[PDB]
Motif scaffolding. Structure first.
Motif, PDB file in Angstrom:
ATOM      1  N   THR A  51     151.069  15.837  90.694  1.00 36.24           N
ATOM      2  CA  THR A  51     151.897  15.233  89.660  1.00 36.24           C
ATOM      3  C   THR A  51     152.468  16.335  88.782  1.00 36.24           C
ATOM      4  OG1 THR A  51     151.966  13.566  87.895  1.00 36.24           O
ATOM      5  CG2 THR A  51     149.982  14.916  88.060  1.00 36.24           C
ATOM      6  N   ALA A  52     153.778  16.277  88.539  1.00 35.05           N
ATOM      7  CA  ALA A  52     154.426  17.288  87.714  1.00 35.05           C
ATOM      8  C   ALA A  52     153.980  17.221  86.261  1.00 35.05           C
ATOM      9  CB  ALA A  52     155.944  17.138  87.797  1.00 35.05           C
ATOM     10  N   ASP A  53     153.372  16.120  85.848  1.00 33.98           N
ATOM     11  CA  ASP A  53     152.914  15.968  84.477  1.00 33.98           C
ATOM     12  C   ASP A  53     151.806  16.972  84.174  1.00 33.98           C
ATOM     13  OD1 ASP A  53     153.418  14.223  82.137  1.00 33.98           O
ATOM     14  OD2 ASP A  53     151.280  13.793  82.313  1.00 33.98           O
ATOM     15  N   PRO A  54     151.953  17.830  83.158  1.00 34.39           N
ATOM     16  CA  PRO A  54     150.823  18.704  82.799  1.00 34.39           C
ATOM     17  C   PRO A  54     149.591  17.932  82.372  1.00 34.39           C
ATOM     18  CG  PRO A  54     152.824  19.347  81.613  1.00 34.39           C
ATOM     19  CD  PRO A  54     153.158  18.104  82.358  1.00 34.39           C
ATOM     20  N   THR A  55     149.780  16.785  81.718  1.00 33.53           N
ATOM     21  CA  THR A  55     148.671  16.041  81.136  1.00 33.53           C
ATOM     22  C   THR A  55     147.841  15.300  82.172  1.00 33.53           C
ATOM     23  OG1 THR A  55     150.397  14.433  80.584  1.00 33.53           O
ATOM     24  CG2 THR A  55     149.496  15.754  78.787  1.00 33.53           C
ATOM     25  N   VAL A 107     147.585  28.010  83.137  1.00 32.77           N
ATOM     26  CA  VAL A 107     148.588  28.238  84.168  1.00 32.77           C
ATOM     27  C   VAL A 107     147.879  28.805  85.391  1.00 32.77           C
ATOM     28  CG1 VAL A 107     150.747  29.374  84.732  1.00 32.77           C
ATOM     29  CG2 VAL A 107     150.310  28.634  82.392  1.00 32.77           C
ATOM     30  N   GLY A 108     147.736  27.981  86.425  1.00 31.28           N
ATOM     31  CA  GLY A 108     147.059  28.389  87.638  1.00 31.28           C
ATOM     32  C   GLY A 108     145.554  28.327  87.509  1.00 31.28           C
ATOM     33  N   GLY A 109     144.852  28.382  88.633  1.00 31.63           N
ATOM     34  CA  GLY A 109     143.405  28.367  88.622  1.00 31.63           C
ATOM     35  C   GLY A 109     142.825  26.989  88.849  1.00 31.63           C
ATOM     36  N   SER A 110     141.569  26.855  88.439  1.00 32.24           N
ATOM     37  CA  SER A 110     140.817  25.613  88.532  1.00 32.24           C
ATOM     38  C   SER A 110     140.302  25.220  87.151  1.00 32.24           C
ATOM     39  CB  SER A 110     139.664  25.761  89.526  1.00 32.24           C
ATOM     40  OG  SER A 110     139.170  24.495  89.925  1.00 32.24           O
ATOM     41  N   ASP A 111     139.551  24.124  87.109  1.00 32.19           N
ATOM     42  CA  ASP A 111     138.952  23.640  85.867  1.00 32.19           C
ATOM     43  C   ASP A 111     137.713  24.477  85.581  1.00 32.19           C
ATOM     44  OD1 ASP A 111     140.934  21.741  85.685  1.00 32.19           O
ATOM     45  OD2 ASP A 111     139.705  20.113  86.489  1.00 32.19           O
ATOM     46  N   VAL A 112     137.870  25.498  84.741  1.00 35.31           N
ATOM     47  CA  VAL A 112     136.781  26.424  84.444  1.00 35.31           C
ATOM     48  C   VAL A 112     136.432  26.489  82.968  1.00 35.31           C
ATOM     49  CG1 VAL A 112     137.678  27.763  86.380  1.00 35.31           C
ATOM     50  CG2 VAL A 112     138.109  28.526  84.038  1.00 35.31           C
ATOM     51  N   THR A 170     127.026  19.651  79.300  1.00 37.04           N
ATOM     52  CA  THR A 170     128.340  19.075  79.054  1.00 37.04           C
ATOM     53  C   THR A 170     129.409  20.141  79.244  1.00 37.04           C
ATOM     54  OG1 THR A 170     127.321  17.590  77.437  1.00 37.04           O
ATOM     55  CG2 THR A 170     129.713  17.710  77.450  1.00 37.04           C
ATOM     56  N   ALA A 171     130.464  19.787  79.974  1.00 36.09           N
ATOM     57  CA  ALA A 171     131.668  20.605  80.105  1.00 36.09           C
ATOM     58  C   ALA A 171     132.874  19.690  79.934  1.00 36.09           C
ATOM     59  CB  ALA A 171     131.706  21.325  81.452  1.00 36.09           C
ATOM     60  N   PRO A 172     133.111  19.196  78.720  1.00 35.06           N
ATOM     61  CA  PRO A 172     134.136  18.162  78.538  1.00 35.06           C
ATOM     62  C   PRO A 172     135.533  18.695  78.809  1.00 35.06           C
ATOM     63  CG  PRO A 172     133.123  18.764  76.420  1.00 35.06           C
ATOM     64  CD  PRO A 172     132.566  19.693  77.446  1.00 35.06           C
ATOM     65  N   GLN A 173     136.353  17.855  79.430  1.00 37.05           N
ATOM     66  CA  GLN A 173     137.752  18.153  79.724  1.00 37.05           C
ATOM     67  C   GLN A 173     138.587  17.207  78.864  1.00 37.05           C
ATOM     68  OE1 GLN A 173     137.934  20.964  81.339  1.00 37.05           O
ATOM     69  NE2 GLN A 173     135.728  20.633  81.574  1.00 37.05           N
ATOM     70  N   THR A 174     138.903  17.641  77.647  1.00 33.77           N
ATOM     71  CA  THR A 174     139.635  16.783  76.730  1.00 33.77           C
ATOM     72  C   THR A 174     141.092  16.653  77.171  1.00 33.77           C
ATOM     73  OG1 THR A 174     140.412  18.470  75.172  1.00 33.77           O
ATOM     74  CG2 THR A 174     138.135  17.701  74.934  1.00 33.77           C
TER      75      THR A 174
END
Ligand SMILES: *[C@@H]1O[C@H](CO)[C@@H](O)[C@H](O)[C@H]1NC(C)=O
Ligand SMILES: *[C@@H]1O[C@H](CO)[C@@H](O)[C@H](O)[C@H]1NC(C)=O
Ligand SMILES: *[C@@H]1O[C@H](CO)[C@@H](O)[C@H](O)[C@H]1NC(C)=O
Ligand SMILES: *[C@@H]1O[C@H](CO)[C@@H](O)[C@H](O)[C@H]1NC(C)=O
Ligand SMILES: [Ca+2]
Ligand SMILES: [Ca+2]
Ligand SMILES: [Ca+2]
Ligand SMILES: [Ca+2]
Ligand SMILES: [Ca+2]
Ligand SMILES: [Ca+2]
Ligand SMILES: [Ca+2]
Ligand SMILES: [Ca+2]
Ligand SMILES: [Ca+2]
Ligand SMILES: [Ca+2]
Ligand SMILES: [Ca+2]
Ligand SMILES: [Ca+2]
Ligand SMILES: [Ca+2]
Ligand SMILES: [Ca+2]
Ligand SMILES: [Ca+2]
Ligand SMILES: [Ca+2]
Ligand SMILES: [Zn+2]
Ligand SMILES: [Zn+2]
Ligand SMILES: [Zn+2]
Lengths: 276, 263, 276, 263, 276, 276, 131
Positions: free
Chosen positions: A222-226, F213-218, F227-231
């Motif tokens: 999805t192009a959406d950043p959110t 910009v780029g990468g993974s959820d780190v 807990t590693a919350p992704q707000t």
């Protein structure tokens, strides 16, 4: 029978579940497996396709219904891939350097795109809504864009000088371009080498699942950043041997197909909606 | 009351039976999908329970009216009563508690099952119309609590799912611009007939005439006849509440009330 | 829609007509004009596309809606023709020596087709119904047919010796083969040069109109000898110059689109729906 | 009615008290775990509320009957009424709204708390049996809406959580093959007694006898006696409805009805 | 007291909450920390274990209750890990090259496994259900598999000729093999340096937590492609110093133990189910 | 407001929604786009700021509202970051080697912090609550910690000899230290190079959103391992070119601002509230 | 009431329906197996279909008996009531549809409407004796 008209459905509760249709679907449907060349190279067997067909036959799929399509690498596979089976499973190897290309391929095959032609030489183009993107594919796509103002004059660019344009792709074999909506852009694309199309994302493509072999969750369809939705059609498996990968795929083909649905667009009902 | 109504009807004057929670709606837990597709992941439609004196209805949109004109989705629910009700007290509540929790529902043809994950938004532009012969007798707009429907044979509940123009980040996270739609916007309505008056006889929460007739027929193993459904099933009886059925039902209910005076 | 496809639609015969939707149809659709290379050669102008787009704009089509695709000749265009946008108008120059090729192309692009792969190297094939044909296309198609009997023995042709088969095509860029139904046939095809598919004619194609430039009424879009229908989408005009042809197409675009229907466009531009 | 029943009782004749929403079920919000473990992540069992005239029961399986013998998990709830009810009108509804939202529930010993995250599936093979002396008096299979129980003292609600043989991708995503189980499959049942007849006196939603007796006892600070619970509390009274308690309660209720004629 | 039977437990939904048992649990239980050798190397302190024990004492753990077990690396630790403390925390350093090895290690220690012997010489082995796997451990495990058919003859393999066997593990310290269920397989394993066991995944191992020190979320403790659950016992932290990691472990030990429960299989109630 | 902060606010659940305030929010707010120097280098244009401002104007932001602030890299931007306007969008280029530094910067700028001076040369310090940390930043931070006991004697570290202290940071431009609570610590810091403050995490920061910009959820913006919350303010996108990144930010600016809230901007631009 | 009282198969002309409230007309379009060249020309094996096969029935109730009042081609009760209401500009009431429109009245022929309509029709018949 009544095609082109959306008739409401008024089902009820307590109608009782029907029996499992999984066996019937396996009997009547076809399954395509898309794997990279290195998979076959590592397996190093000339009958592995036959063995996998037999193993699938143990799982209910009739012989001759499971197909094994091979692609060299992601870039080559991103050259207008044609997925024609009833159910398509794409074994896509993870590369940390090709995250965006992986995302673009998944977005192109995990979704439905109504595409109309683009003639950059003749017209200026704008993306009307958030579902409108520009999809370009071929041997090498280099797209440069010049945003225009209400006076049809380039913004930070000269309409007559393409060297001042802004580069959004370079040597790509597939790229999805999202520009600011409501703005006319002049486009300079290597039309001789690759083709661009104005594409609207209608919605999910349900008969295509992508199994990311190794790596982490890096796909963004999805192009959406959110938003970075991980749909049920995006599996991830840690791997060392391709034989284990294929044994896992065949052993959980029930789960894999359950995560997918018959292509809503490719069936008699969609007649006079887009196809068939 | 029953013998008085019998005598008045034999004289053809108005007869009126007063019911606390009249059993006017046959049981039906149903849904309608106005927008659907085989994956059942982008659905717009309505689901309702019409049972006894109660009607819970809920309009759901999986896209939360992201692409709906003016960001509003209109839902309508028409319930045709089998008999005209008068002097009816109705409680109307904004939400339908029965369709506000996660639910795995069967397909309309039963081939598969789909998933429902409601997030409740207050219904918008609520209009409850009580109609007689297709003419609006009573209309209630944005009104909740106790209302009076003086004479009606049909109920029309029209309500809108309006996408909140302004959302906090937690709310905005629930309704993305496109699929997948994990949370599905639902507006509801609950309509309970506390009391009413009907010219015909009906089962209700306070009286035991239907219970008495059913008990007498079950105890003595009365074979199914040509008028009533097997076991005096109230849903089947009220669904097809024919004039002959109404006459027989009034007869047996009057006899049951006579018997209750002694037994 | 699909679940309610098998549901009735009821209409009153006194419902007031809606306003004309032609303006809205043009403002939201895309038009493709397929013309031969000789047309652009004889016009001998490089900006003629801009002029035609402006004339269409005068006729109500927003700039960017109309597209112009060129093809060398009837033969080349028949190799997997692609229909790109909502409305496809194909200008086909008439040649008295290529009547069957024009008929085949018109049959392919004016009707819906559902095609499957034919592994002619492995299996014998049948045409079960009058709607079933064998459509083959590519650089050069040469199809030889050997009808078999209940014992698989060829009739008037030895199974091993292809030289004794029966020729139905030679170096064709497209051919629609129709053999007797209920008889198994062995097929020899130049698979390296062209692909053959077992296809079923679903019905007409409303988004494609064919304008025959010059000539007479010679198209036969149905294999049945007793029927040669002339549908509303099969136009014919007389010409001395191509500018007159294009002006006629622009001036009567409303009539041409009236002969065509919406919703017939498919996501993919392919000329048929492929199932493997 | 009360003096009539008093005189009939004194002569040992068939007495009858008609109750609208009889308060026959002592309050109890309880659960039973047929399968459990210290972390309470793979639970199979039933949770119920029996309150007044209402019974809400819900069978939950955390594995959604994945390893069940036929992908069927059977749940049974038996409610024993302290007195025999006759001529009973009963509304039976598929879902139990009270056990259809996320809950944090104390363990049976109160040592810890476990998590409940219901997803409501349609109950399967619903069999409501109304039993007298252990014998089947009334049976209703897959019937919802209004039903009649002519004579019974026990209710047996049998239902099943059936795994849907076919699931859309979202539904199949809810129910994996092994732990963890984030969504727990729940089937429900609601059973309301709208009206009934009992040979004994009961508190109900229409009469004010219990309220009158309790109010008189509280207004004058009557010391607790040897017969009634020490608040005139109805749950304790109906839980242990002894013959002595029934005699005293009939006496005081008859006197309260006499008083209400004047006060 | 009644050990061999599963008796239902009834509870009231309104009884009470007992006081917090965290203090007593810390007093009467033992904690084990598993960490790589490089952590000890970087810390480079002789008495660091004593300091950590004192810090845990500040958190309510009696002295001597906390144990620290060293392992060289993920692969070596994967050889028959023995977690004997009441509460086990494993600090597992993330290596992007060892994703599947870490997945296998976690699947082995984060789950409960009931394992029977495998005599690959005597018998051919199937996998009955989804929970059936083949777990092999040793100094070097190399597993090659030949899937048979209903006649006991190999599919793409010869039972006598191991050279044709399909390799699924090569020099593994630990490997969990998943093959197609219902198919008999001949196994060739390096029995000298590796033992293979036919194991069933009973369920979670409550009293083992794995804290991944490093990269993104990559663990997949489920052999099913469609699911990659992240349980509360699979923690993940970003790090630059090991002292920071251990201070975080000590400071938030309440939360770590809260994410864990007493091993259901290790208490008297488990007696005569499998163990104690 | 302060006097009525501890007063109830009562609302009816039927109060009509107000109109969209997005247009008024844009017309009266200011937007800051923080990007790395490599972004401007790869764009290689000097008027690109004007083009982005004009595109934002097309999106509804009046000219002059959007501001572009450049930073060299994550390490340099972490030295007392300044958040200047109502809405702050930080484009953070991902690097697999600086995961903890990215986490620390995101934790600092995505949360409210209340910091006090730490005179490490004079007094020992404690972290009273889980919300208490020690945030140190400057040219180069090297923090050495010595836990003490009731008698001030260091545990595993002599108080006088700093060489025996425990290293938690080295040459850091920003570090958030989390030691065991309730234990007095002696701190050795390069005060001449970088400053350390005793900080308390008040809560989230709504006016700052970080797009990775780029990468993974780190990112892990909480010290708690469990807990590693992704707000909603922590976005992630895939990129091959920076112009596509900026066009994505402009096109979906409405969505980005929706994830952010007003009134979160303090009077000062600092990253924390300092109390001396 | 859902029960078949009368059934007529392949019958045309006059038929008698003794007691009914529902009519169910079932018919079939059968493709003629043997077609002369013109008929075969009308019906191809595939589209386009220029000639469309149609099978029709006509049902005409000449006389009937009803327990309720109805308008009919012979009497003038509906005409008289409508004429009187129109001549004196009677505002629309709560029972009958505006203008005494028969289609709306018979579409929703409720018991209250039945009572009112029988009353007014009886009055109209009384009036027609003299006027
Ligand atoms: C469905 O399944 C049941 C039980 O599995 C079986 O008895 C039955 O024959 C099947 N078919 C139908 C149509 O119910
Ligand atoms: C249709 O045309 C009429 C007549 O010009 C106009 O009044 C009306 O607004 C148009 N649109 C619709 C939707 O009827
Ligand atoms: C539990 O906690 C309460 C409240 O602090 C305390 O009074 C009591 O003594 C504690 N112990 C027990 C056994 O309840
Ligand atoms: C809100 O929008 C409505 C509908 O366009 C408009 O009438 C109204 O003036 C707007 N402003 C307010 C304050 O309601
Ligand atoms: Ca690319
Ligand atoms: Ca430029
Ligand atoms: Ca765009
Ligand atoms: Ca995204
Ligand atoms: Ca040809
Ligand atoms: Ca021959
Ligand atoms: Ca044929
Ligand atoms: Ca023909
Ligand atoms: Ca082999
Ligand atoms: Ca391994
Ligand atoms: Ca297996
Ligand atoms: Ca998995
Ligand atoms: Ca740092
Ligand atoms: Ca030290
Ligand atoms: Ca701390
Ligand atoms: Ca954390
Ligand atoms: Zn459906
Ligand atoms: Zn418990
Ligand atoms: Zn009541």
């Amino acid at each position: 029978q009544n095609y082109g008209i959306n008739l409401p459905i008024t089902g009820s509760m307590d109608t009782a579940y029907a029996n499992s249709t999984q066996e019937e679907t396996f009997l009547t449907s076809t399954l395509c497996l898309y794997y990279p060349t290195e998979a076959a190279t590592e397996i190093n067997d000339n009958s592995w396709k036959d063995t996998l067909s037999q193993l699938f036959l143990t799982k209910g799929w009739p012989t001759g219904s499971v197909y094994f399509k091979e692609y060299t690498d992601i870039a080559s596979f991103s050259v207008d891939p044609q997925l024609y089976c009833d159910y398509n499973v794409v074994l896509m190897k993870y590369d940390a350097t090709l995250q965006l290309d992986m995302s673009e391929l998944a977005d192109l095959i995990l979704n439905e795109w109504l595409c109309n032609p683009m003639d950059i030489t003749l017209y200026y183009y704008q993306q009307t809504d958030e579902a409108n993107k520009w999809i370009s594919m071929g041997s090498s796509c280099t797209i440069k864009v010049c945003p225009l103002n209400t006076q049809t004059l380039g913004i930070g660019c000269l309409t007559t000088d393409t060297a001042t344009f802004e580069e959004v792709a370079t040597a790509e074999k597939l790229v999805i371009t999202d520009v600011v909506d409501g703005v006319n852009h002049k486009l300079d694309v290597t039309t001789a080498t690759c083709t661009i199309r104005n594409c609207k994302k209608l919605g999910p493509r349900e008969n295509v699942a992508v199994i990311q072999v190794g790596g982490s969750d890096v796909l963004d369809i999805t192009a959406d950043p959110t938003t970075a939705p991980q749909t049920e059609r995006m599996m991830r498996i840690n791997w060392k041997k391709w034989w284990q990968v294929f044994y896992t795929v065949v052993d959980y083909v029930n789960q894999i197909i359950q995560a997918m649905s018959k292509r809503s667009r490719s069936l008699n009902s969609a007649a006079f909606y887009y196809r068939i | 009351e029953y013998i008085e109504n019998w005598n008045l009807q034999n004289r053809r004057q108005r007869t009126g039976f007063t019911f606390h929670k009249p059993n006017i709606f046959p049981y039906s837990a149903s849904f309608t999908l106005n927008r659907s597709q085989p994956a059942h992941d982008n659905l717009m439609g309505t689901m309702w329970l019409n049972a006894g004196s109660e009607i819970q209805v809920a309009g759901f949109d999986y896209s939360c009216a992201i692409n709906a004109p003016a960001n509003i989705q209109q839902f309508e629910h028409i319930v045709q009563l089998r008999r005209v009700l008068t002097t009816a007290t109705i409680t109307l509540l904004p939400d339908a508690e029965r369709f506000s929790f996660p639910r795995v529902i069967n397909s309309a043809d039963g081939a598969t099952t789909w998933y429902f994950n409601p997030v409740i938004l207050r219904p918008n532009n609520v209009e409850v119309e009580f109609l007689l012969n297709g003419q609006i007798i009573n209309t209630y707009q944005a009104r909740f609590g106790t209302i009076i429907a003086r004479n009606f044979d049909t109920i029309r509940l029209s309500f809108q799912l309006m996408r909140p123009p302004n959302m906090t980040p937690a709310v905005a996270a629930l309704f993305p611009n496109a699929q997948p739609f994990e949370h599905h916007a639902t507006v509801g309505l609950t309509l309970r007939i506390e009391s009413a008056v009907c010219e015909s006889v009906l089962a209700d929460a306070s009286k035991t005439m239907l219970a008495n007739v059913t008990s007498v027929r079950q105890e003595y193993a009365i074979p199914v006849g040509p008028v009533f459904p097997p076991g005096m099933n109230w849903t089947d009886l009220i669904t097809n509440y024919s004039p002959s059925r109404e006459d027989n039902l009034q007869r047996v209910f009057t006899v049951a009330s006579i018997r209750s005076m002694l037994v």
